[PDB]
Amino acid sequence: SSQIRQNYSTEVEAAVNRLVNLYLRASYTYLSLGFYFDRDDVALEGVCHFFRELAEEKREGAERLLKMQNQRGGRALFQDLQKPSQDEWGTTLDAMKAAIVLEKSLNQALLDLHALGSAQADPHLCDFLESHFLDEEVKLIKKMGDHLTNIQRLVGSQAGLGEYLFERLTL
Template sequence: MQSAVKHSLHSESEAAINKLINIKLTASYTHVSLGMYSDRHDVALPNFSRFFLELSEKEREQAESLLEYQNLRGGRVLLQNIAKPSREDWKGGLDAFSFSLEYQKSLNNSLQDVHHIASTHTDPHVSFYFFTHFLLDSHETIKKLGDHISILMRLRSSEPNGQMGEYLFDRHTL
């Protein structure tokens, strides 16, 4: 049955939003994995853990925002299975941040895809919503992750395996 409030929401935009909801929930799950990795006794980087868990929370909140937006526009929410993270272990904080950066770039591509679909179907509301609520934030997160990686690489370059640099970064930067 067609929603009484659905107006100018193209079915392709509706499907793309549903796909993005799943992507955001998977991202939240993946960042929980990164946070728990950082909190393990053999890694012991509590501020790395806090950073990743905050990213997880932000992704979950954005997924909830998309759910609410889909309902607001009269679309149908179709939840999908959430895939487990593609990795379960990392080689330290720098590897975890590098993984998160690449993951965030792929999330940004998914956001741009939805923005493009909305633009193609002349839906300025979806375009504006995604630009203001998601794309700008995504670019800021990519910048922050890149900055952290640059600092970590400089700290690690002064010692053979970089563990002291990660420890100092965890204690004094995050």
């Protein structure tokens, strides 16, 4: 019996906890992506930095969700964190394709939560997502899309050259 809880459904509380798991999973995926590009046999520093900064962003998104859970009077509940889908991530192109899949999944989870909030008439939740998540995700996905296009135009008949140049001149 929380003294502050008001207009905060058990459905939203549960879905926030699920979303925290999804963001921490994504953080973990990006940690693995980063360290893969730091391997001496991969050695793409800008690519490593791109993903390591996304691991931090996703961690921060989970903590924002956790703060909000406590502000609303819900209870944070943590579950096991699955490991990333792959141990090795291929080329930069392969990695950026996996990243945009991942971000699309996070975006769909945000949209689903927003729809739940709207069904539960929880405007504080709706505002929260609008303020801190939805535009961030659109912006990120757009950038990834721009990167994919630049990566793909650089493949040509000289894929290693293009992978180097992209890392050097964009990342």
